[PDB]
Each structure stands twice: as C-alpha cells, then as structure tokens.
C-alpha cells in the first residue's frame with residue numbers, strides 16, 4: 673500500500689502512543705524492525721507479512737492498543753501499515 677499516504681494516517685491516529693516509532697505504553701514493543709519481528713503477532717511467526725500483520729493489528733486492536741476498524745477507512749488502514757513497514761524495514765524512525 674502507499675507508505676507516503678500512510679504517514680499522514682500515522683500523524684493523525686498513532687503518534688500519541690508511538691511517537692518516534694517507540695511505544696509509550698509498553699516500551700519494549702516498539703515499531704522498529706527488530707522489535708516487530710520479535711513481538712508482532714503473525715509477522716513474528718512467519719505466517720503474515722509485516723504489512724499484513726500491521727494492518728490486522730490496526731484493524732482489530734491488541735492488548736491495550738485500540739482497534740481502528742470502523743474508525744478508519746480501508747485505504748487508511750492499508751496505507752498506515754505500509755508506512756510502518758517502510759519506516760521499519762528501511763530504518764527511518
């Protein structure tokens with residue numbers, strides 16, 4: 673999906689909890705490449721790509737992280753997942 677469009681979704685919906693690619697709530701579980709591969713459901717087990725696993729967790733929530741299905745459009749969810757994947761894979765945080 674469109675990482676550049678996803679940056680705007682991130683600023684509007686994710687930066688209060690994840691400024692800098694970190695995690696204000698659960699500090700280990702950051703948005704950096706190494707942390708994602710260790711802790712993000714589906715991606716950590718190899719059964720999902722990074723981008724799919726991010727999209728799933730944004731849509732459905734996890735733990736203390738709220739769900740965004742019904743709050744964000746399909747394209748916005750897909751695009752923010754692409755932003756996370758691009759930021760992490762290319763070490764841009």
Ligand code: HEC
Pocket residue numbers: 682685686687688689690695697698700701702703704707708711712713726729730734735736737738740752753756
């Ligand atoms: C604070 C109320 C949050 C908001 C809003 C968003 N996220 Fe979040 N996220 C939060 C927590 C507490 C956690 C950990 C969940 C758990 O217990 O495992 C997460 C996790 C993620 C992850 C995975 C990180 C990892 O496992 O290392 C991703 C990819 C993620 N969050 C993305 C994300 C996006 C894109 C958001 C805006 C749509 C978003 N989160 C909001 C807390 C909060």
